[PDB]
Ligand binder design. Structure first.
Ligand SMILES: CC(C)(O)c1ccc2c(c1)[nH]c1c(C(N)=O)ccc(-c3cccc(-n4cnc5ccccc5c4=O)c3F)c12
Ligand SMILES: CC(C)(O)c1ccc2c(c1)[nH]c1c(C(N)=O)ccc(-c3cccc(-n4cnc5ccccc5c4=O)c3F)c12
Lengths: 240, 258
């Protein structure tokens, strides 16, 4: 659980996010790790949920290795952000990326754990091109995420497994559009108002009819009519 | 430099550019503004934000004024002076020869100012010039192309690169200078005097570079007199050093009007 900082080396800077800088390093002189040096956070509240997060273990989830309490030590993902990877592929590889994320989300759904900010910017890519979900449940300890939010979140702040489903459909669109920003011609407030009245993302060029039916199923105005991640995974597996 | 988005209203869409949708709006409930949304992923934002400090201080009556930026949330916005007659190219296509020379003068005065501040436009063309309610032409989006992430816009061989407004040193070597803006200005004068024809119509982007490499140039528009053509043609010298400066061009334009 607790890692001693004397067992970490702080090498190349990888990038900057909401909580600060993330660096590449070595743990115990041998393992590649990403060290999130938190500047910005309700730390006491995070430290209590970190045990629950340590126990979330799935091959398509970026693994938390430990904490320095502050630093969050995680699995190193050599191809960085999915959004960067998509902007810098065969249709079969794009569906595999959706599958990877869906498997991670079906696991979080099975553990009653909400991501709360699912988007391609929170997905990472390893040296083998496997996509994994990162920063799950971290936003609770902190306008642009309006573009990944269903109407019940925008109007009522009602977060559930069905609000992560909506975000997942937008993520599938981000994958199939090769990293376009969703709702390119609308501001954050306009997105919010226009999706509540029926605006949905268009079908990307690279998405087949069956692929669009799966992402579109995520955007039902009624949360109860949206599928679950078990159903989405099954549908993705049937298409490939 | 920072504008709180609570002080902006985002009204009609004007069009779409390289970075995204441009909207008309109001600032502090009273001032007309253009709000240029920068789609996330389309710009090198950190480098733009540092040059915005320099762009705030570029102030001239024939330059579309930068009023501020909204960078605390994505997508970021660039707030500028509102130009009610929109694009010069649209204005030309929808005039006495004296008014055409006055439009060249307006642009030349803005460019003489950017030249005096060592600031390169990098994408001068009638599509980047705007027209206000009084018919005054102003230069917009100066220095913004340096922050575009799409290589199709940025490389001299790219499909969206402005080859038709570029001198040979830009096309061959990516050498931008005050003299590459001078070349673009001559093409802009031709766009004005031809009433908004696309330069080198019936030439693809790569056939245009070859035409330039053979020492060929845009023909004289029939609305252009001999003296007007000598001014635009002076901008297209194969040698950058032999091209005039904007002070000289302005002086020549002022002499032709007299
Ligand atoms: C070596 C490489 C490929 O340059 C790279 C780059 C970043 C990272 C990287 C490798 N590996 C990780 C890991 C990890 N666990 O290994 C965790 C977080 C980050 C990371 C940290 C901050 C910001 C982003 N970030 C966020 N949004 C973006 C939207 C568009 C384009 C890039 C980014 C973009 O790098 C990050 F990805 C990175
Ligand atoms: C109300 C009116 C006259 O319809 C109008 C229209 C556009 C604009 C406008 C007013 N005012 C501005 C301002 C500003 N600062 O006020 C800045 C940018 C744009 C603008 C934004 C995107 C694309 C173009 N654009 C680009 N190239 C063209 C080639 C041919 C014909 C039209 C266009 C053509 O509108 C734009 F002009 C506009």
């Amino acid at each position: 659980m607790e890692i001693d900082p004397k067992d970490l080396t702080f090498l190349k800077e990888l990038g900057t996010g909401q909580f600060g800088v993330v660096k590449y390093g070595k743990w115990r002189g041998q393992y590649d790790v990403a060290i999130k040096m938190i500047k910005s956070m309700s730390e006491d509240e995070f430290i209590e949920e970190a045990k629950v997060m340590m126990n979330l273990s799935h091959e398509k989830l970026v693994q938390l290795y430990g904490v320095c309490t502050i630093f969050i030590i995680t699995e190193y993902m050599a191809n960085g952000c999915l959004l960067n990877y998509l902007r810098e592929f065969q249709t079969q590889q794009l569906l595999e990326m959706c599958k990877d994320v869906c498997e991670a989300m079906e696991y979080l759904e099975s553990k009653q754990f909400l991501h709360r900010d699912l988007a391609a910017r929170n997905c990472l890519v390893n040296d083998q091109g496997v996509v994994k979900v990162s920063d799950f449940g971290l936003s609770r300890y902190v306008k642009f995420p309006v573009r990944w939010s269903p109407p019940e979140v925008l109007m009522y702040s009602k977060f559930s497994s069905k609000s992560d489903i909506w975000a997942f459909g937008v993520l599938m669109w981000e994958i199939y559009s090769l990293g376009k920003m969703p709702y390119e011609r609308f501001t954050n407030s306009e997105t919010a108002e226009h999706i509540a009245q029926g605006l949905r993302l268009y079908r990307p060029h690279l998405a087949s009819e069956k692929v669009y039916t799966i992402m579109y199923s995520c955007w039902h105005e009624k949360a109860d009519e949206r599928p679950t991640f078990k159903i989405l995974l099954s549908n993705i597996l049937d298409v490939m």
